[PDB]
Design a protein around this ligand. Sequence first.
Ligand SMILES: *CC[C@H]1/C(=C/c2[nH]c(/C=C3N=C(/C=C4\NC(=O)C(CC)=C4C)C(C)=C\3CCC(=O)O)c(CCC(=O)O)c2C)NC(=O)[C@@H]1C
Ligand SMILES: *CC[C@H]1/C(=C/c2[nH]c(/C=C3N=C(/C=C4\NC(=O)C(CC)=C4C)C(C)=C\3CCC(=O)O)c(CCC(=O)O)c2C)NC(=O)[C@@H]1C
Ligand SMILES: C=CC1=C(C)[C@@H](Cc2[nH]c(/C=C3N=C(/C=C4\NC(=O)[C@H](C)[C@H]4CC)C(C)=C\3CCC(=O)O)c(CCC(=O)O)c2C)NC1=O
Ligand SMILES: C=CC1=C(C)[C@@H](Cc2[nH]c(/C=C3N=C(/C=C4\NC(=O)[C@H](C)[C@H]4CC)C(C)=C\3CCC(=O)O)c(CCC(=O)O)c2C)NC1=O
Ligand SMILES: C=CC1=C(C)[C@@H](Cc2[nH]c(/C=C3N=C(/C=C4\NC(=O)[C@H](C)[C@H]4CC)C(C)=C\3CCC(=O)O)c(CCC(=O)O)c2C)NC1=O
Ligand SMILES: CCC1=C(C)/C(=C/C2=NC(=C\c3[nH]c(/C=C4\NC(=O)[C@H](C)[C@H]4CC)c(C)c3CCC(=O)O)/C(CCC(=O)O)=C2C)NC1=O
Ligand SMILES: CCC1=C(C)/C(=C/C2=NC(=C\c3[nH]c(/C=C4\NC(=O)[C@H](C)[C@H]4CC)c(C)c3CCC(=O)O)/C(CCC(=O)O)=C2C)NC1=O
Ligand SMILES: CCC1=C(C)/C(=C/C2=NC(=C\c3[nH]c(/C=C4\NC(=O)[C@H](C)[C@H]4CC)c(C)c3CCC(=O)O)/C(CCC(=O)O)=C2C)NC1=O
Ligand SMILES: CCC1=C(C)/C(=C/C2=NC(=C\c3[nH]c(/C=C4\NC(=O)[C@H](C)[C@H]4CC)c(C)c3CCC(=O)O)/C(CCC(=O)O)=C2C)NC1=O
Ligand SMILES: CCC1=C(C)/C(=C/C2=NC(=C\c3[nH]c(/C=C4\NC(=O)[C@H](C)[C@H]4CC)c(C)c3CCC(=O)O)/C(CCC(=O)O)=C2C)NC1=O
Lengths: 49, 172, 172, 132, 162, 160, 160, 115, 49, 161, 161, 87, 22
Amino acid sequence: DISTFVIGNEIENIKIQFIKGQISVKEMINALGKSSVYLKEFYNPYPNI
Amino acid sequence: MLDAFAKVVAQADARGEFLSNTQIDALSKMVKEGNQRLDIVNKVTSNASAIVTNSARALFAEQPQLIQPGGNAYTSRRMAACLRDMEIVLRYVSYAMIAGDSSVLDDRCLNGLRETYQALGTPGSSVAVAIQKMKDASVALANDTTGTPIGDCSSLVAELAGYFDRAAVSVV
Amino acid sequence: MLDAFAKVVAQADARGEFLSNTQIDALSKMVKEGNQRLDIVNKVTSNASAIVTNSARALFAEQPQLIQPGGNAYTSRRMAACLRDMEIVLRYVSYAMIAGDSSVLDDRCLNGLRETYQALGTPGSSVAVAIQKMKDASVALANDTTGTPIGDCSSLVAELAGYFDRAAVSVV
Amino acid sequence: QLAPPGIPPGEDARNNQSLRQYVARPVETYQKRSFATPLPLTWTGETETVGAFDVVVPPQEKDLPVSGEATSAFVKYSDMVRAERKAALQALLSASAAGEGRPTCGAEGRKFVSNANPVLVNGVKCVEYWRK
Amino acid sequence: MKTPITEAIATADNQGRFLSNTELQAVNGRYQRATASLTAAKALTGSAQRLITGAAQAVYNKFPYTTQMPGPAYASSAIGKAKCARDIGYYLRMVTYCLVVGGTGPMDEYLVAGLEEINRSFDLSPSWYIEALQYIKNSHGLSGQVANEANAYIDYAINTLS
Amino acid sequence: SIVTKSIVNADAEARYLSPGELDRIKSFVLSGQRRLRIAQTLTENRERIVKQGGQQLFQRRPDVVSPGGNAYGEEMTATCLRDLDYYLRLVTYGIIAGDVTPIEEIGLVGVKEMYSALGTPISGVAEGIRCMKDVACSLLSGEDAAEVGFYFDYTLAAMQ
Amino acid sequence: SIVTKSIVNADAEARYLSPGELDRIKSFVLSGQRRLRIAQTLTENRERIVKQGGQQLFQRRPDVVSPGGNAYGEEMTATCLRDLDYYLRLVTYGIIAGDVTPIEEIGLVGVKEMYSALGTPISGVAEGIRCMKDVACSLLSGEDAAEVGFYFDYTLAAMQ
Amino acid sequence: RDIYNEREKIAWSIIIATQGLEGFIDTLLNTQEYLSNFGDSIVPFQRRRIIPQRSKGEMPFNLKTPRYGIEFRSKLAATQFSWASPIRRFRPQEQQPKAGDPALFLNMVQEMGPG
Amino acid sequence: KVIELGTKHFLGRAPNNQAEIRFYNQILASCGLQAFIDMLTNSQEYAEI
Amino acid sequence: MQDAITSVINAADVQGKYLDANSVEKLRGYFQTGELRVRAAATIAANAATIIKEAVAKSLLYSDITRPGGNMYTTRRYAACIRDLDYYLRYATYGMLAGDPSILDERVLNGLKETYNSLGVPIGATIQAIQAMKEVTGSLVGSDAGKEMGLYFDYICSGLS
Amino acid sequence: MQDAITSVINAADVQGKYLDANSVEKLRGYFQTGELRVRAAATIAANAATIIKEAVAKSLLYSDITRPGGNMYTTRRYAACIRDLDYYLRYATYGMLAGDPSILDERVLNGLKETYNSLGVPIGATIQAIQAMKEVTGSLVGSDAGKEMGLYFDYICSGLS
Amino acid sequence: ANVAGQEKIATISGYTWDGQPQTEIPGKPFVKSIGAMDYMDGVEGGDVVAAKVGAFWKPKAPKEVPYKRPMGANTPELPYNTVPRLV
Amino acid sequence: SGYGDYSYSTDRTKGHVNQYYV
Ligand SMILES: *CC[C@H]1/C(=C/c2[nH]c(/C=C3N=C(/C=C4\NC(=O)C(CC)=C4C)C(C)=C\3CCC(=O)O)c(CCC(=O)O)c2C)NC(=O)[C@@H]1C
Ligand SMILES: *CC[C@H]1/C(=C/c2[nH]c(/C=C3N=C(/C=C4\NC(=O)C(CC)=C4C)C(C)=C\3CCC(=O)O)c(CCC(=O)O)c2C)NC(=O)[C@@H]1C
Ligand SMILES: C=CC1=C(C)[C@@H](Cc2[nH]c(/C=C3N=C(/C=C4\NC(=O)[C@H](C)[C@H]4CC)C(C)=C\3CCC(=O)O)c(CCC(=O)O)c2C)NC1=O
Ligand SMILES: C=CC1=C(C)[C@@H](Cc2[nH]c(/C=C3N=C(/C=C4\NC(=O)[C@H](C)[C@H]4CC)C(C)=C\3CCC(=O)O)c(CCC(=O)O)c2C)NC1=O
Ligand SMILES: C=CC1=C(C)[C@@H](Cc2[nH]c(/C=C3N=C(/C=C4\NC(=O)[C@H](C)[C@H]4CC)C(C)=C\3CCC(=O)O)c(CCC(=O)O)c2C)NC1=O
Ligand SMILES: CCC1=C(C)/C(=C/C2=NC(=C\c3[nH]c(/C=C4\NC(=O)[C@H](C)[C@H]4CC)c(C)c3CCC(=O)O)/C(CCC(=O)O)=C2C)NC1=O
Ligand SMILES: CCC1=C(C)/C(=C/C2=NC(=C\c3[nH]c(/C=C4\NC(=O)[C@H](C)[C@H]4CC)c(C)c3CCC(=O)O)/C(CCC(=O)O)=C2C)NC1=O
Ligand SMILES: CCC1=C(C)/C(=C/C2=NC(=C\c3[nH]c(/C=C4\NC(=O)[C@H](C)[C@H]4CC)c(C)c3CCC(=O)O)/C(CCC(=O)O)=C2C)NC1=O
Ligand SMILES: CCC1=C(C)/C(=C/C2=NC(=C\c3[nH]c(/C=C4\NC(=O)[C@H](C)[C@H]4CC)c(C)c3CCC(=O)O)/C(CCC(=O)O)=C2C)NC1=O
Ligand SMILES: CCC1=C(C)/C(=C/C2=NC(=C\c3[nH]c(/C=C4\NC(=O)[C@H](C)[C@H]4CC)c(C)c3CCC(=O)O)/C(CCC(=O)O)=C2C)NC1=O
């Protein structure tokens, strides 16, 4: 769950957009994977390998 | 039985804490309406028999089966009970309107009315249609000037209609 | 409501037969204690308010949630009801101790107490912990010397503790 | 058999009710009325109470003395480790050897840890089956 | 809950009648009395911590034996002083609730119903709380009808304690 | 830090820092001296800032220190002033770093969860931070106060 | 444990337990009941044993509680009584195990190093153990006291 | 006495709603059932609660019906742990010691007296 | 590591169990290298193989 | 995961056996306590936040670990640890409903000590917080359900130590 | 190594506790079965060679592993494997006397799979020979002692697999 | 939910301490109270510091439309001589 | 590694040892 490693205003517009039925599951997952949260957790602390 | 002033205090004792200033200007503004609210309840209690009889007459001109022989509205006593069941809900809606909170409405009027009407075989949907027809006449009668200063009362008639819909969904 | 003497008679009428001599010297022994039993109930009724207040004080120094705002022991009426609910169980335990049988304890104290506490939302396990803390103080106060002849009372304080445990398992 | 509870027999209100406004009657029993709850028998000789004559205080620590087999066999066993026990005590007492090396733990802590069990070290042997 | 609203409703329901002009006037009195009571509630909220500490100190100065005598009922130890301050805060909270509500509805429900049972069992003198309430009445620093309305709910608690 | 953030944002794209990022790093290292001066002024006036912010908070929110409030009692009030001191220290860190990374990584990520688990109203903390912001900006010049309140505003936005 | 030690001593030689070792295991399991009884008596009289041993120690060795002694002060005296309780517990373990393996593996291996690193005189601990031995043997029968002091004597020998 | 069946509560629920509490228990006390058993001169009581030879009874009416039931529990029953800001502890571990703590022997050193 | 190299060169095998490692670790603890060599060569295992 | 029923069926099936009298014994034992288990699980679901709050307040709220330098100093770490305690409570409730701690082995304890050691989380403080949570939980659910829940709480503490 | 008594004493000592009622329960349980354990150990010491001979004859004596190419073809390998089976039987007897399989962990199973894998010894055939030895041993010592011995036989087989 | 309650944004109906759903009318679960504050504006985010929700820079339109427009082809056609029970 | 970063070296805290008198 995200709430221990985010402030709260990072993926809010992505959540509101999916709850309204504007984006599919795949678009929400794609937008989720290219957020600043994913960059901070699984890209910055590790090597590319 | 609570009024709207009682409700914030009953939620303030629970946390054991003083009312902050935002709750206080929420309450002074509410008070500052004040006269409008009692103008509303004055208009409903001045015309209560007319509301009830016109709603019942529209109900039976609409649904003739209740006064058909064998209907639930049959017999001199069952019509007399149906006449002022509606007047009971009108009385408790006016109590909840003057209180600012639907605490007297839930506690003595709508508490256990559903299985009361189930145990008698009374169709609760027709009671709800009667409640809706009393509601329409009450909000129609509420927003006329009739010698009152001109202003907006919209947030009060929305609450008055909300009490009627709360009564209508709880019966059925 | 039976005493221990009426127990054997109520089981003697059922078979329709006279009490044999073994039941009789079972009963003359029970008479021959006699004074010890009333010394026990005298010690509990002399100190009843102390037992109840010290047990309640230990209960709230232990479980502070009941007196926390929102708790089951909050305000002035719920604490007043909790104070002497314990005094009711102490009274009926003393009645059952003087009777020699837990027939008055089941009839008019423990009969329907569980769904009474369920219908109110009262936590029955905390009532049981309060019963246990009254029990410990009562058996501590029972076996003490206060200008009384030295002897053993062990079979009586075991029965006194058994009444308390019967009250404690039936509430929860 | 009988009409539902409370309903006066013969004057139901659902008699000729239409199907488009008929309400199903909820079932009601006498389970919650006070007269219907089961009492103790107590005429068949069954009082469901508790009192004197059912109190028992059995001792579990010193219930009463223990068997002769355990006693005789403890005396037996004690007549078996006595020689070796006194020999071990004798080996401990006069085994007052000196130390060597810089102390690691206060003034003690020299080459050997005190009271270390030697059988753990010397009791595990390297064996070569078909030895060299 | 005793408000001017709910007692008017209770008087209309006892006859089983609609709300007459009697009830509407009784409600209108609450409405043009409320403006000073809400100011009293704001002002007693703002000065709360200071008044509780001063009232506890005034009780300790008037009755010095409460800080010296050993026993659970006295404020000789630290938990006793904490519970004494908790009780004074309870009294001030009920006074503010009665101020904003408009009658002695909250404190009748929360404080005085079964009050002397506690003072008799837990062996607490009501004169201590009387001395605290007299300090709170003397030291709230209000003026006019704000003072007249706060004092009138203070001495109701004083009258019930006596 | 601005340098760190520029380096990561350039690292994800697998490129060196463009001349814009280097320009901005240069401008930052050139302003570092007044950044340290402003951090000085805010740092060594901490007692007055915390005290006067605590006052404005307790006058604006009397419920938190009212009988039973979250900060009710001597110890709880001391703990609340401790929290305000924490946030002032974080603001000084952010001022010297040139970016809210220190403030946000320490004290903002998961602050709602913590304060909900503690039973503290987050709006009271926001009020305290706003009061401290006014008190602290009162002691700075025009441009300095503008740049310093820049971080108090971010801390308030994150703490809604 | 006697069973454990017999098993290891038979394991090193790569043989099953001879009938002598099995005889001794049998005699041990037969005496286990009075072993548990003796452990009961010593176990549940621990307060008097520790108290009266501490007295005899402090009267025999006033220097350890004299001003500045290792056990000087309330806290140090409490810690010394704690140590005596440790050793009484170990003696009960050894009584039920039928052998000093529990006592020696816990509390005897490296005891000199520990007490030298702590600055405690080991002779004082030996005196305390002897005093506890007398107090504890006073509460047993003749044969029981003989068998129980059998372990106190080993603990004293190891603690020279 | 107990209610006969649930239809009787439906029957008498209406006098409260129309004629007030004052007209409800007006009609209740002027019944033949009240004047038959208690008259004007006798405090009422539960009639025939116990069957004579039996021990057990039929749940006296204060226990049978408390102040509120299931209908109102959902609304004004209390709770545990209601975010209620208690009086704090500051040292919960020091209150009772652990196993190897020498704090258990502080009530023993006075007992050992050099005299 | 010095303990394993000692047993390998002077006894032709690895350390046996954990109790053997405590015996040599304390010899290296207080006496040092030359005392460790003396315990190995003067052992009863050395004498018989 | 396998509950009591699954474990009995597996023990019977791994021998080609039909469910005999001992399996019936265990199955009846589980079926008798199921209703108490459901009651306890409902009550625990009702008061999870207050249980965690009270356990943290009694165990590590004012100690030095919440102070600068402690493992749970910053707000990130405080939130992370309260989330961990929520995990422990929820999985103990699952284990109590199932009557079998295999879910704790599969979903909680597998690689937990190693994660805590790599992160630097103090194990003793965690075990003490779980012990404090056991107190409050047994308190709230009564004696029998408290012993049931304490079984799995102690299982987690033993797997963590 | 630790037996049942040592394990109980350790569990009690690791908590600063005195031996309470549950420890007494376990200790009585061991003391009641000790005499049966001694009887079984004596009987097994009496007939070790015949047990190993019969297990080898029923498990792998005429299979292809004893022919050219199989593990244990030559006389060296046959002797080595019968010595291994003797080890397993002796250590299972030790574990049965102690009532605790820790000796099997410390003296037998530690690094055994790795040695067998480096040598090329088939693990399945070894487990089957141990299973056949379990049959003969339970046969010779009767039902209760056979279940006791089979506990540690299955422990060895699980540690080897 | 406790945050939403504590900051006076809205009351969320939860459960009782023993796990049963809260409700003001015992028919269905999670039925909450109403009145006098469900119809007040400018208190959408009350007690939240500087909550800018909507068009905060101005007061809002007077909210009046007290007339009924005949619905053409969109009047909800219901059955005659009966009541739509449920749906 | 970031800003709020735990180190045993910089941990002056009795969290790894339970000294509950501090
Ligand atoms: C528009 C009329 C609708 C209708 C009414 C109806 N009601 C009944 C019977 C009863 N109604 C009640 C209701 C109340 N009692 C109360 O105290 C309160 C205050 C909260 C209410 C709302 C009761 C107790 C009865 C039974 C007693 C009686 O009336 O004699 C009846 C028929 C009478 C009978 O069932 O014998 C009718 C016809 N039913 C409809 O068809 C209309 C939709
Ligand atoms: C230590 C106090 C525990 C506790 C008590 C508690 N009880 C209630 C409410 C009631 N208790 C009864 C009980 C009895 N009535 C009887 O006639 C008898 C004789 C056999 C008993 C035991 C009843 C009828 C009530 C409801 C009436 C009322 O008290 O107003 C209450 C709260 C009051 C309420 O629910 O509004 C408490 C607090 N509860 C605890 O938390 C303690 C463990
Ligand atoms: C016995 C009880 C009792 C009362 C209710 C009041 C009745 C009343 N209402 C208003 C005053 C008012 N009454 C209304 C109400 C309305 N205007 C409309 O156009 C709508 C039809 C209706 C809304 C439902 C408004 C809007 C005002 C105030 C004018 C304003 O706010 O601009 C005033 C003038 C004094 C004042 O403004 O405060 C009075 C005496 N007095 C009483 O003694
Ligand atoms: C009003 C009621 C009432 C009473 C209870 C008795 C009180 C009382 N008890 C005893 C007599 C006694 N009382 C006790 C009781 C005790 N001794 C102890 O050490 C225990 C603390 C305690 C047990 C609970 C015993 C044991 C005897 C008799 C002495 C004996 O049997 O050896 C006697 C002496 C006469 C006799 O022995 O019969 C009297 C007058 N009298 C009364 O008028
Ligand atoms: C407009 C359509 C319409 C209907 C069809 C009926 C449907 C209907 N029938 C009955 C009621 C009944 N219906 C039957 C039917 C039958 N009896 C038998 O023996 C056979 C099975 C079958 C006749 C061939 C009976 C016996 C009753 C009476 C049931 C009773 O009193 O318990 C009732 C209950 C109300 C009442 O008692 O009248 C209703 C709603 N009503 C309607 O409004
Ligand atoms: C609803 C509002 C409310 C009131 C009024 C209230 C009073 C109250 N005060 C109590 C105790 C107490 N009250 C005090 C207070 C004082 N004693 C002194 O010596 C001082 C002079 C004085 C402080 C000014 C003390 C010391 C106790 C503890 C007494 C005991 O535990 O025996 C107790 C006993 C339960 C407990 O231990 O907390 C109650 C119920 N509780 C409430 O919930
Ligand atoms: C020269 C560098 C070097 C070091 C440091 C070293 C350490 C080392 N420490 C050991 C054990 C140990 N080390 C400790 C240490 C500690 N326990 C604690 O709780 C503390 C945190 C910590 C002390 C500060 C303990 C208790 C053991 C014994 C383990 C056991 O008996 O199971 C052992 C096992 C050997 C034996 O004692 O038999 C070695 C080899 N070896 C080396 O060559
Ligand atoms: C560096 C970032 C950071 C922050 C902010 C932080 C906060 C933090 N605030 C705490 C308590 C607290 N904080 C408050 C604060 C308040 N009460 C109010 O009413 C006001 C709204 C508010 C003051 C403005 C109170 C009263 C407590 C004690 C709560 C209790 O113990 O019940 C605690 C628990 C005890 C402690 O201080 O160690 C932590 C860890 N930790 C961090 O690492
Ligand atoms: C379902 C079973 C399960 C558990 C339990 C689990 C724990 C777990 N705890 C973590 C961190 C953590 N856990 C804690 C916990 C604590 N700090 C203390 O002082 C206390 C003793 C303790 C709480 C009682 C803290 C502070 C961190 C953050 C470490 C850090 O940010 O460096 C992390 C790192 C992930 C992250 O937060 O980014 C994981 C994966 N994962 C799982 O899958
Ligand atoms: C390459 C070196 C080598 C040898 C020698 C060897 C021997 C060997 N001899 C065997 C059996 C046997 N060997 C004999 C031999 C004899 N009976 C007598 O009386 C005579 C003295 C003797 C013949 C000269 C018998 C009877 C068996 C079967 C025993 C039985 O199954 O009971 C078996 C078991 C079954 C089998 O043949 O696979 C092996 C493995 N294996 C090897 O790898």
